[PDB]
Design an enzyme around this catalytic site. Sequence first.
Site, PDB file in Angstrom:
ATOM      1  N   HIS A  41       0.852  -1.216   0.000  1.00 22.58           N
ATOM      2  CA  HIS A  41       0.000   0.000   0.000  1.00 22.58           C
ATOM      3  C   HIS A  41       0.883   1.260   0.000  1.00 22.58           C
ATOM      4  O   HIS A  41       0.300   2.370  -0.142  1.00 22.58           O
ATOM      5  CB  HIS A  41      -1.059  -0.032   1.115  1.00 22.58           C
ATOM      6  CG  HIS A  41      -0.568   0.265   2.488  1.00 22.58           C
ATOM      7  ND1 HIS A  41      -0.814  -0.577   3.562  1.00 22.58           N
ATOM      8  CD2 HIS A  41       0.146   1.295   2.975  1.00 22.58           C
ATOM      9  CE1 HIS A  41      -0.295  -0.052   4.653  1.00 22.58           C
ATOM     10  NE2 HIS A  41       0.312   1.087   4.317  1.00 22.58           N
ATOM     11  N   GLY A 143       2.628   6.612   9.430  1.00 23.80           N
ATOM     12  CA  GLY A 143       4.070   6.454   9.160  1.00 23.80           C
ATOM     13  C   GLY A 143       4.673   5.186   9.771  1.00 23.80           C
ATOM     14  O   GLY A 143       5.823   4.868   9.389  1.00 23.80           O
ATOM     15  N   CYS A 145       3.546   1.971   9.476  1.00 27.62           N
ATOM     16  CA  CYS A 145       3.406   0.790   8.583  1.00 27.62           C
ATOM     17  C   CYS A 145       4.802   0.346   8.133  1.00 27.62           C
ATOM     18  O   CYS A 145       5.665   1.207   7.908  1.00 27.62           O
ATOM     19  CB  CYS A 145       2.464   1.077   7.421  1.00 27.62           C
ATOM     20  SG  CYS A 145       0.804   1.554   7.967  1.00 27.62           S
TER      21      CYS A 145
HETATM   22  N1  LIG Z   1      -8.714   2.665   9.354  1.00 27.62           N
HETATM   23  S1  LIG Z   1      -9.560   2.203   8.026  1.00 27.62           S
HETATM   24  O1  LIG Z   1     -10.092   3.377   7.452  1.00 27.62           O
HETATM   25  O2  LIG Z   1     -10.442   1.154   8.417  1.00 27.62           O
HETATM   26  C1  LIG Z   1      -8.349   1.590   7.026  1.00 27.62           C
HETATM   27  C2  LIG Z   1      -8.309   0.225   6.703  1.00 27.62           C
HETATM   28  C3  LIG Z   1      -7.309  -0.311   5.894  1.00 27.62           C
HETATM   29  C4  LIG Z   1      -6.317   0.529   5.396  1.00 27.62           C
HETATM   30 BR1  LIG Z   1      -4.879  -0.283   4.304  1.00 27.62          BR
HETATM   31  C5  LIG Z   1      -6.311   1.899   5.673  1.00 27.62           C
HETATM   32  C6  LIG Z   1      -7.335   2.415   6.490  1.00 27.62           C
END
Ligand SMILES: NS(=O)(=O)c1ccc(Br)cc1
Lengths: 304, 304
Positions: A41, A143, A145
């Site tokens: 990602h 940051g 991840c």
């Molecule tokens: N906190 S969320 O809006 O559920 C979210 C889920 C997966 C990602 Br990869 C980024 C954000």
Amino acid sequence: SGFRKMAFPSGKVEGCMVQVTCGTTTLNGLWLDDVVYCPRHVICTSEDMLNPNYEDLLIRKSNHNFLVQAGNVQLRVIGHSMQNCVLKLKVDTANPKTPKYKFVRIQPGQTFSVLACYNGSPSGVYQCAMRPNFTIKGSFLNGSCGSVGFNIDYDCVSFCYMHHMELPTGVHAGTDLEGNFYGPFVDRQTAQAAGTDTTITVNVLAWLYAAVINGDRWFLNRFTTTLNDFNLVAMKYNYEPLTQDHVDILGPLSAQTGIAVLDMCASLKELLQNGMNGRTILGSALLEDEFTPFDVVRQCSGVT
Amino acid sequence: SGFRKMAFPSGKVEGCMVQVTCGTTTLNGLWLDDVVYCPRHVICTSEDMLNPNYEDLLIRKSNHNFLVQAGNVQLRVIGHSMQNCVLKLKVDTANPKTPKYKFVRIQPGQTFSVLACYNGSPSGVYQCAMRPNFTIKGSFLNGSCGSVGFNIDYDCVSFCYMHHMELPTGVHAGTDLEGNFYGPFVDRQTAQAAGTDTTITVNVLAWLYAAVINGDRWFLNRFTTTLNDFNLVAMKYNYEPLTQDHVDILGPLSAQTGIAVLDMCASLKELLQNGMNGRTILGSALLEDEFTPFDVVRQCSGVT
Ligand SMILES: NS(=O)(=O)c1ccc(Br)cc1
Ligand SMILES: NS(=O)(=O)c1ccc(Br)cc1
């Protein structure tokens, strides 16, 4: 004496953390030999995150679009591939601080150390468990991840976790180092709910043994039980079922303390039914489940 | 999101740990530049420990009686002196991994990371506070003496603690790196009792702010209080008095959350009087006091 929530020394993993940038996104990468591992990602605009097609987004990326920085020196990216939910960036330089390492997929209840990083720089280290719902309760800001979870067996770092996302409930989800999510989570900004966060029974029992070893004995009762009787009470209290494999794993703590596993089960049974009554065990007012039997043996014997 | 008991990354301190042996006693030393620091009780037979005269015991020791090993290489000792309760062993080799460092004497309530070591080898890292009675609640087995506590300010390690002894109650006592005990403890195998282990009020308040920031708000009440009114309730509950210096230190958490310090005091007041009623705050059933205001800001902002 004393018993602490204890992380592995983080030095071997500190020497592996790099900053990965793709366009406007910066997160952390793990540099082992001539490969940098990071969450795929990294290639997404927060717009892309809502419904990313990673194969299609990746067509638009070359080696030179991935900026890898180790301390304040840039590494040359000479190759990139997607393995499940991680990017593997081949770099022209083997990490000179690469430790002996393995990639391992852990089971729910297994504990590990997390080196929380921002811009490839370590900020802290803490101890986690893989929850029975395949979430972890971490401490991760934007940051963070690409931060990794690990165990150390003497001089070999087993990498078991890479941080990818926070659920809307603020619990955490990630992959092994082959990029396979723990549990049913996907790297997409979509509502994902966690299942029942049950208590890791075998871990509570290990910590009850750690308590006896450290002189906290008040909860030791005059009863025993059976796996089936214990498990009925466990189920009612959202505790994981205890198996004979769990009982076997507890054997050495059983032997050291002279408390049969099923006796300690009967003590835990009474603690569930009666509660703590304002008392503490090892300075905790609730039953701790993020020490494994192996963790308790390690800390109560002093492995390095 | 999420909030964890978090130690500093230990790498910079791992690179400083050596094994010190004097006769039959092995413990840990800290190697900074060309000096190895260790507890002076390294020179004692457990017979000596009962009533040691360290000046007299030291007459019987030469440079060559101190065996210093770093990894599996021996360092040449070219000098030794006693400073308070630590030995300083001058070695012929500057530690090539010496970080930027300071020696600091911390105040009660100050938190720090401990790298627990055995035979100069790191086994784990955990977070501690200097208790108001100048004890720490550590995790230390035989061989762990000379293990150090530290804070990191970016690239500068502030060493604040060296482990010396366990009280018969199994709490821990040690020195700063100038060898001065925290509190009234002496390096002698004699009954020493700790005073009242009071709760670090300013640290509880910081952690209540950390809780609000992470969405745990159930305990926020409709009341405020004054320092004097709060302090009357604090005294009754063996909480440390809160001063205006504490209120000032909490200012940034106050500002971020829009909760006045005295309002949060009134919430804590109700938590003391009413208890948790089986509820948790940040996964704890008791009020946590081993996060400083600075710790909460650091973790809730992501300093590296
Ligand atoms: N906190 S969320 O809006 O559920 C979210 C889920 C997966 C990602 Br990869 C980024 C954000
Ligand atoms: N655990 S104890 O017998 O109180 C003790 C005190 C000080 C030293 Br130094 C060694 C042992």
